[PDB]
Amino acid sequence: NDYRTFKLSLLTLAPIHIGNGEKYTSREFIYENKKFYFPDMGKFYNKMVEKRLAEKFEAFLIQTRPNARNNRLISFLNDNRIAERSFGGYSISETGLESDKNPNSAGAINEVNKFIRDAFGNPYIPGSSLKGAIRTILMNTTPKWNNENAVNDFGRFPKENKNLIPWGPKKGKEYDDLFNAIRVSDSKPFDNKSLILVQKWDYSAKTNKAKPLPLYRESISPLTKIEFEITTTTDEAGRLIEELGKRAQAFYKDYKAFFLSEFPDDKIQANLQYPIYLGAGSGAWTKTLFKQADGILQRRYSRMKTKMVKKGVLKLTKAPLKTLVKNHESFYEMGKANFMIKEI
């Protein structure tokens, strides 16, 4: 059997938010206790049309009043005197900060995203999300996979070409397909009592500040052990998983000196293991070939929200401190994760 497995022990330092596309709006959650209750809004409006309130509730959603605590749907269940709390959905506890340090402004989060969940509702990290993190470590370190993932002359700085890495049917030829020979399996469904909804904190250079954003990202608490079973079938893939001890160091060495250099140092976490950058909030420079995207990635922004000062502002969040941050005021990195492999 050429199926030599592995066991990639993913440990999160920064909170990791990944997938599901959808997002709750600012009328789809309840903050009464220190938890955010996200109801099943099909069961909300059904239970509330039975209380003869759907005429006022439709008028409640077109109501743009100041003092945003009186807009976030706790005030609808306060002013209309409803205390049953029997609705579909779940609850996640508060981050602790998860607003910009104002006690009166609590519950003033507006749009959370939704972390990826199976049909049982439990969160998990899929293997397809974890494999896109390995593929950046494997593309960036390999010299052959950096010389020209060119714009092909068919677009403006258009695409990796999709042919730098050999893949396909290749009629007449054999079938190598290196990344078919790396089979990242999905993680076990863990519990949604590890989810905290960190808020984005854009810390830019040349304007030494950390202007927050109205994005929430239900994401995993730090110091969480998540396991992936990665099997390989080829000698060519059996080397490249074994070389993650060299390349994930050499990627972060190549990435600290490229982008994390010229940022102030106290925000940046320490590794403690082999580092990896998982989805949703690790900037564009960890989802890319970071040394072949300097004149190409900034083409996409002739807008009001442009990526000024070349490389975009470092993406930080706020979450409670455990065991790490290496700076006061709780500045994590949104995706600074750590793994170590072992073969089974």
Binding site: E22, T25, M41, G42, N46, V49, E58, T64
Partner: protein
């Protein structure tokens, strides 16, 4: 109201009847309505157009009631979506579902709005 033989030509007319940015002559005759606000509306209906195939109508009538919530709510936020639900008679058509085959007719009606919006500019 929309039958099966007209609901795409209704949605073709509603995009044309929708206004454009007559000022700001930088690629002009563009809409005030944007693609991402429009795809937030279809993201509600597209997850019912495929649970109409699987499930009964007798279980979907909780979220079909919720489409009148959020088509109103998205209309209240931005004035561009406010014009869409007036021109494309969506709030009229949403109160007229009553079975599976109109739910799929309305959810194909929202896809016709996205299609011609992508087509016309």
């Amino acid at each position: 109201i929309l039958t099966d033989e007209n609901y795409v030509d209704i949605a073709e007319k509603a995009i044309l009847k929708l206004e454009r940015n007559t000022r700001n002559r930088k690629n002009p005759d563009a809409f005030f309505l944007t693609t991402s606000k429009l795809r937030n509306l279809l993201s509600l209906t597209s997850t019912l157009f495929d649970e109409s195939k699987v499930k009964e109508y007798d279980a979907l009538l909780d979220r079909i009631a919720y489409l009148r919530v959020q088509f109103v709510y998205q209309a209240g936020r931005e004035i561009a979506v406010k014009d869409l639900i007036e021109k494309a008679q969506i709030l009229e058509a949403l109160k007229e579902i009553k079975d599976r085959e109109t739910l799929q007719r309305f959810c194909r009606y929202m896809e016709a709005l996205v299609a011609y919006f992508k087509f016309y500019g």
